[PDB]
Amino acid sequence: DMPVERILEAELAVEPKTETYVEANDPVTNICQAADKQLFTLVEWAKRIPHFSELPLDDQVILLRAGWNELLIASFSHRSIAVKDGILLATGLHVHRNSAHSAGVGAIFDRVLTELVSKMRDMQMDKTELGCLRAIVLFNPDSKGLSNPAEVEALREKVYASLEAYCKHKYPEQPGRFAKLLLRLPALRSIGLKCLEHLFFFKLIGDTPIDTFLMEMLEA
């Protein structure tokens, strides 16, 4: 089975706290520190997604190494609908369009805002639908090297079967809402790939502190 309630619980359990925003210099360094912090909570999130831990350990490694970039982008994109503009980092820092463009990531920042944040705010995507989308991203059966891709595909199919039931039950007046959710995933895939390209460049220059976990994700 794949209950949406358990997926929603996984979202809130790793959600950043108001505490952290109230409590809060280089923009790219800050963003990279937020990414490293969030990779640790991404592992705890995945363990709370039904059946994920029952997969072979090597498949859990492969699913998280393949999906972490998109999974984290989906999180701070949906999180940022609570404010009028910009991106809320999990560290509490608030990245605005000025700072993003001055730091050299304005075009990818804009793609996040237009193709992900603004669409999520427009359709009022709730955290249950976001968690299901991330679980679909997590259960990617196309990941190279999986020892049991069929089970990963089965789990992905169980997630979006529950997602469609949840959407038709909670939003019965929007018959295409389920498909609209799934059709943000191509943009996420594209924005994820473009984000990694910037990250690898900042890593290559070597003037950007990259903490241990994020550094481990970037080295094959």
Binding site: V43, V61, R65, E216
Partner: peptide, 11 residues
């Protein structure tokens, strides 16, 4: 390889 990710998943 994947030192940290394997450790965190092991728990």
């Amino acid at each position: 390889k994947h030192k940290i990710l394997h450790r965190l998943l092991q728990d």
